[PDB]
Design a protein around this nucleic acid. Structure first.
Ligand code: NI
Length: 84
RNA sequence: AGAGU
């Protein structure tokens, strides 16, 4: 069995934080062709991994702690703006 | 309203 990813150690000073969302809004956070979550990464200077379709709906957000926190808030605000 | 070789 093969795949096309691997697990990498963070650079020193960079943390990875698990951002859980409701199951029904994973696709909403990603957006079409990733447009929403690519924008959040670009705006917050973070690296984000979308959960697998068959796993818990937890994004992993990697970067400086202050940037990761901003990305977390961007994800939560995007959800809230669309779901109230 | 699911992007990544
Ligand atoms: Ni392959």
């Amino acid at each position: 069995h093969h795949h096309h990813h691997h697990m990498s150690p963070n650079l020193p000073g960079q943390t990875t934080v698990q951002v859980r969302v409701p199951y029904r809004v994973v696709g909403l956070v990603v957006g079409p062709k990733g447009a929403t979550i690519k924008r959040i990464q670009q705006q917050t200077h973070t690296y984000i991994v979308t959960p697998s379709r068959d796993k818990e709906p937890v994004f992993e957000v990697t970067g400086m702690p202050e940037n990761v926190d901003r990305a977390r808030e961007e994800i939560e605000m995007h959800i809230a703006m669309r779901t109230g």
